[PDB]
Design a protein around this nucleic acid. Structure first.
Length: 789
RNA sequence: AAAAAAAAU
């Protein structure tokens, strides 16, 4: 129900000086006056609401607002630094821009002293924090295009396909111990370019020029996908709901004449009669707007400016976006500073009105660089790897338990013309040598090596292979770029036949490298039930003194959402079992969690003959505004699973939410602490003192090495803890769990269970309502291992 | 899909 208080502060690791993009706010102890607004019509966009309020304030300055400067949340909430001479009866006003009836009303008083008190125990008024947020973002909301908690403006920076890059910034008011903090970060997102729809068609369908004939059923579907749901404007604004199958010259709608009789009239004829316009491109289809019979010719419409792209970016579009937005930690820090200078909060008329001051310097924070765990390998010398800067390798090292592979097949879906027999021979030869060094000895040539084309030849090939070659362990599949055969390989391999398969690009077969092959063996060994490595047993937190299961949960959204929950099946912890469910479209709560947890607990017991005394639950993809809902349903669900298992089974539950999607950045104060070209904080720096929750149990942990851009320190918030973790042990625990990810010899940004859950859900996507839950269900033998690696 | 990191009428 209620998150536990922070148990302690923790002292492990060497200290490091840091700066965070949190700027201290000096806030008065005055009272804020909260006014509610009823404005009619009530379905207007927040910007129109803001202009109405804006003109309402000036227009009624003499009798109502005077010199006061009210702030407005865009909807119903207006705040003033001093009370309006209206409290507390009904005041109805009329506002003209085009006429609106605005009534205004004092709801309560926001005590800022009651905010100061919460910042030091007194265990936090969400409404007071919200009031300040409204104050800080009133001015930028008028000047920029607000997107969620961010602001953007047009800069000229194309992504292609009518998409554009707008630069801007995130801004939010956050609580911490003793102080309100202003979180400020640079940002950039995809927007649709403001242009005639005709040109939008060209960029979408790859036309240098529109100049022609009606679109094929192929072109129209692609175009319909892009423009659907977008706003257009007449050269009045409309919402595009569909693209007509027919051209404007033939697309009809019922038109009532003066006789009263309704006749079908073409869009072209109407625009000719009514608007004196002979359609220049009558062969093109129309935009259907409003709801079901308004049709608009493409040539009279423009894509409305200020529309953010929500739909999935192409691989090239995102890359360009990654590129134009990626930059080192020192670079990012300087631009946050510049934004602070340009924002100039201490001269903003509205924060001045509310007597607020914002410190110009980033908050100084002492971080702690946790010691990485030793990594134990096997083979001849049972070598121990020491992670350096979040990275180690397997030179002179062999798998903890390597799988001696004797039977395997190759299925090349790359053309023999490009992936010739000498490539395969060379590829096989190099692969076996590396596997030999890795302690996963591939013995003997492949028992089978063939060519095939199309996703439709996978199963008959796979049935063949299973029946004929006894003890068949692995099928290495070779693919040419992006193609739907990969999805079919996984479906047949994971769900119906239950065979371990390892896909690999054609180019990685033609030109092989020792590092690529080594990484390939990492996935192969674990998919055959092997153990690449384990955490050094004696170098583990006290939680491993009793049987314990680690859970990773995550739900991915697109039609249906996909919930995935993984669970550790040994005490290392190394091997994980996967549970997955299709569920309601865009529902964050894992509906069938109890059943999923039950399955995992059963599997844990069948593998270790132990029942875990502790359940450590890492939950990814949850925002702070949802913390009480997921905790309510999911903690109860986990608890329901244990009770349903056995009446008196009551293991301690630790519920932790992991967040990568936030805007707190940590920068090295000392240049000597900067790592690599990107100049990021080292792997393992932990923060839980100055920018964290005033009362609750939360911390930042950057467990990964920053390769490019600015690192995102993962945030962890303990929603529940029966197990009474200290700060140090938990922080050390999650950090060590980040070293158990099998796909690479690197510490990753989130603990392996959380990461695995993401992979499981992503794999479920390739697996494609009774049917949806069955096309996602996995084969019996496959479930015994980590197929999703 | 070798892999991690990195922006989202």
């Amino acid at each position: 129900f209620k998150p536990p208080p922070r148990p302690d502060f923790g002292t492990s690791g060497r200290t490091i000086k840091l700066q965070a993009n949190f700027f201290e706010m000096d806030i008065p102890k005055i009272d804020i006056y909260h006014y509610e607004l009823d404005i009619k019509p009530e379905k207007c966009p927040r910007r129109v609401n803001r202009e109405i309020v804006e003109h309402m304030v000036q227009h009624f300055k003499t009798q109502i607002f005077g010199d006061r400067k009210p702030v407005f949340d865009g909807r119903k909430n207006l705040y003033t630094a001093m009370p309006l001479p209206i409290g507390r009866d009904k005041v109805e006003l009329e506002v003209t821009l085009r006429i609106f009836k605005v009534s205004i009303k004092w709801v309560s008083c926001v005590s800022l002293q009651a905010l100061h008190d919460a910042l030091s125990g007194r265990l936090v008024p969400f409404e007071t924090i919200q009031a300040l947020d409204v104050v800080m973002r009133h001015l930028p909301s008028m000047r920029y295009t607000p997107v969620g908690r961010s602001f953007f403006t047009a800069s000229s920076n194309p992504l292609g396909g009518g998409r554009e890059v707008w630069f801007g910034f995130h801004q939010s008011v956050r609580p911490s111990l003793w102080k309100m903090m202003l979180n400020i970060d640079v940002s950039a997102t995809a927007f649709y370019k403001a242009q005639p729809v005709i040109e939008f068609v060209c960029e979408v369908l790859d036309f240098k020029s529109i100049e022609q004939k009606p679109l094929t059923d192929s072109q129209r579907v692609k175009f319909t996908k892009e423009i659907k749901g977008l706003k257009v404007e007449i050269t009045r604004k409309y919402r595009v709901c569909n693209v007509t199958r027919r051209p404007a010259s033939h697309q009809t709608f019922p038109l009532q004449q003066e006789s009263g009789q309704t006749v079908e009239c073409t869009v072209a004829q109407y625009f000719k009669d009514r608007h004196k316009l002979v359609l220049r491109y009558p062969h093109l289809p129309c935009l259907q707007v409003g709801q079901e019979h308004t049709y608009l010719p493409l040539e009279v419409c423009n894509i409305v400016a200020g529309q953010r792209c929500i739909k999935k970016l192409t691989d090239n579009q995102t890359s360009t976006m990654i590129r134009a937005t990626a930059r080192s930690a020192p670079d990012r820090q300087e631009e946050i500073s510049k934004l602070m200078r340009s924002a100039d909060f201490n001269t903003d008329p509205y924060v001045r009105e509310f007597g607020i001051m914002v410190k110009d310097e980033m908050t100084d924070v002492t971080g702690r660089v946790l010691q990485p765990p030793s990594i134990l390998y096997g083979g001849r010398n049972k070598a121990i790897a020491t992670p350096v800067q979040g990275v180690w390798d397997m030179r002179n090292k062999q798998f903890h338990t390597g799988i001696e592979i004797k039977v395997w097949a190759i299925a090349c879906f790359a053309p023999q013309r490009q992936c010739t027999e000498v490539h395969l021979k060379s590829f096989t030869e190099q692969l076996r040598k590396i596997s030999r060094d890795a302690g996963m000895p591939i013995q003997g040539q492949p028992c089978f090596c063939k060519y095939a084309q199309g996703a439709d030849s996978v199963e008959p090939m796979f049935r063949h292979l299973k029946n004929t070659y006894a003890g068949l362990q692995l099928v290495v599949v070779i693919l040419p770029g992006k193609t739907p055969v990969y999805a079919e390989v996984k479906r047949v391999g994971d769900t119906v036949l239950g065979m371990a398969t390892q896909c690999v690009q054609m180019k990685n077969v033609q030109r092989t490298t020792p590092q690529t092959l080594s990484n390939l063996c990492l996935k192969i060994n674990v998919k055959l039930g092997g153990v690449n490595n384990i955490l050094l047993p004696q170098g583990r937190p006290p939680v491993f003194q009793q049987p314990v299961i680690f859970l990773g949960a995550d739900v991915t959204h697109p039609k249906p959402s996909i919930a995935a929950v993984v669970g550790s099946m040994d005490a290392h912890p190394n091997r994980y079992c996967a549970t997955v469910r299709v569920q309601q479209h865009r529902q964050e709560i894992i509906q069938d969690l109890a059943a999923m947890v039950r399955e995992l607990l059963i599997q844990f017991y069948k593998s270790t003959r132990f029942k875990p005394t502790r359940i450590i639950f890492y939950r990814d993809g949850v925002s702070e505004g949802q913390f009480q809902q997921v905790l309510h349903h999911e903690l109860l669900a986990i608890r329901e699973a244990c009770i349903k298992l056995e009446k008196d089974y009551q293991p301690g539950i630790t519920f932790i939410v992991v967040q990568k999607r936030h805007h707190t950045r940590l920068f090295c104060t000392d240049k000597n602490e900067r790592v690599g070209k990107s100049g990021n904080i080292p792997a393992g720096t932990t923060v839980d003192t100055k920018i964290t929750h005033p009362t609750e149990f939360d911390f930042y942990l950057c467990s990964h090495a920053g390769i490019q851009g600015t690192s995102r320190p993962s945030h962890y918030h303990v929603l529940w803890d029966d197990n009474r973790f200290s700060s140090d042990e938990l922080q050390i625990l999650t950090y060590q769990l980040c070293h158990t990810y099998v796909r690479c010899t690197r510490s990753v940004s989130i603990p392996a269970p959380a990461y695995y859950a993401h992979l499981v859900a992503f794999r479920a996507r390739y697996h494609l309502h009774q049917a949806l839950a069955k096309a996602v269900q996995v084969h019996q033998d496959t479930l015994r291992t980590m197929y999703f690696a």
